[PDB]
A paper describes a structure:
Integral membrane proteins belonging to the multidrug and toxic compound extrusion (MATE) family contribute to multidrug resistance by using either the Na+ or H+ electrochemical gradient to extrude drugs across cell membranes. Those crystal structures revealed a similar protein fold comprising 12 membrane-spanning segments (TM1-TM12), they nevertheless suggested different arrangement of cation- and substrate-binding sites between the NorM and DinF proteins, hinting at substantial mechanistic diversity among the MATE transporters.
To reveal how verapamil blocks drug binding, we co-crystallized DinF-BH with verapamil, and determined the co-structure to 3.0 Å resolution by using molecular replacement and MIRAS phasing. The structure of verapamil-bound, extracellular-facing DinF-BH is very similar to that of the R6G-bound form9, with an r.m.s.d. of <0.5 Å for 447 Cα positions. Specifically, the side chains of N37 (TM1) and Q252 (TM7) form H-bonds with the bound verapamil, whereas those of M33, Y36 (TM1), F60, M63, M64, M67 (TM2), F150, F154 (TM4), M286 and M293 (TM8) make contacts through van der Waals interactions. Moreover, although the positively charged verapamil is enclosed in a binding chamber with an overall negative surface electrostatic potential, no close-range ionic interaction could be found between DinF-BH and verapamil. Structural comparison of the verapamil- and R6G-bound DinF-BH revealed overlapping, but not identical, binding sites for both ligands. Notably, all the verapamil-contacting amino acids except M64, Q252 and M293 make contacts with R6G. Therefore, verapamil may interact with D40 through long-range electrostatic forces, which is likely enabled by the hydrophobic, low dielectric environment within the membrane-embedded drug-binding chamber.
Author numbering: 3 to 448
The structure:
Amino acid sequence: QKQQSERLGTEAIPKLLRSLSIPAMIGMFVMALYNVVDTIFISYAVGIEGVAGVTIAFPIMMIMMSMAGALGIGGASVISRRLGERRGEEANQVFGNILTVILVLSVIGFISAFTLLGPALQLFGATSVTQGYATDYLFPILLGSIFFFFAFAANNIIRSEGNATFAMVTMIVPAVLNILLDVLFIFGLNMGVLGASIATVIAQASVTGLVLRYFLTGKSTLSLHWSDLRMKGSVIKEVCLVGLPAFVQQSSASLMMIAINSMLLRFGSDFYVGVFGLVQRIMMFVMMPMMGIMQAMQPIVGYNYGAKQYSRLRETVMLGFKVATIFSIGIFALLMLFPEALLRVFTADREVIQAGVSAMHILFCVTFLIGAQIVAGGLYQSLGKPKQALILSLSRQIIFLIPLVLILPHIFGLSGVWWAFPIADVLSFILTVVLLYRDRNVFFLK
Ligand SMILES: COc1ccc(CCN(C)CCC[C@@](C#N)(c2ccc(OC)c(OC)c2)C(C)C)cc1OC
């Protein structure tokens, strides 16, 4: 029991979404610029050698942040199921008792910096040029580690409460920084990769600072305590609980895209990695829409399961779905009428826009069914019974995917790239359908 600050606890709920969503929308989008507007730099004061350094370097940042991420979500979906179901103090407790396993690992990374770095780095596509670039990319971030975790944690918890607004600003602001901060090193000085890393730490420093305020200084939205508050909850079990399927979902993609990246180092030493790199943030970029809408329910379908207005959550979960679908068909078409002009960033051969958009064609007559397929994820995860979300993640990500690529690549062709996907996802979607008529209780309304 606590003081629900201006937790928008007030059930104003389909503008709860409206208002809740867009902030996501916003900062999500923003930082995505920083990528873009960062990397276009690394493609300058360095070439395409480092652009890949970066990209081989990438999955190892993901391996840390994944861990934090569970941690973050773990908290999110605890802390939501514990307001509404109004244990407002259990909350307080949790927040910090995460901060713990955080500050534990914020060291594990700092250690592994001075340790496991090169070891794993060299461990696959080690082009003696890019080898250093990834190294000089990766060393700082780990020094490093700390600011990094806190802030995705905080930004997850601050959603998990309600401050999508100050979220925005956990985003908007390393963002703007890390531009001018890059410019400052990268091109401004000459500390290239080596230094656009140190930029993107001095980013995560000067947030961390600010997050403390929205948890210490006029500690806003809610229960937020600092002296002995936390130690080592038996709730650590309770968050990992939740996070369990969360940090699979990364380690899944992540630990499978080390593969497809270093396997793209044996053929295309570099030419091709910064076209992995490239074709990603147009997946993610126009994933946002979806993602953002998701993160609106994150905590909405949080304080209404609790013990609260069940009646008013099926409302969410319907709308949840309802909207995502229209942006499902959306992305989809705009991902199949404009797959030309976005292959005009890819302007090369008249066979580049041939099979180069052959894949980019019916590879994605799946998109439109991805809307649900991904909403169903929050509403097993805000609702801290991620045991079916577990079940669910492993379906999409591995157990149907790889076994489908592998069962096409065992001689079936670069069609083994195609079918392997469009048809994988459908099964995940059909599965997901079943996981909801599984619970005539998320949606116990239509
Ligand atoms: C925007 O440009 C960049 C910014 C930061 C980084 C560093 C990568 N770090 C591991 C940051 C965490 C990855 C991050 C992304 N994208 C991310 C976190 C969790 C996710 O799970 C839904 C996620 O989706 C795969 C992405 C966010 C939180 C920054 C790379 C960037 O591009 C190479």
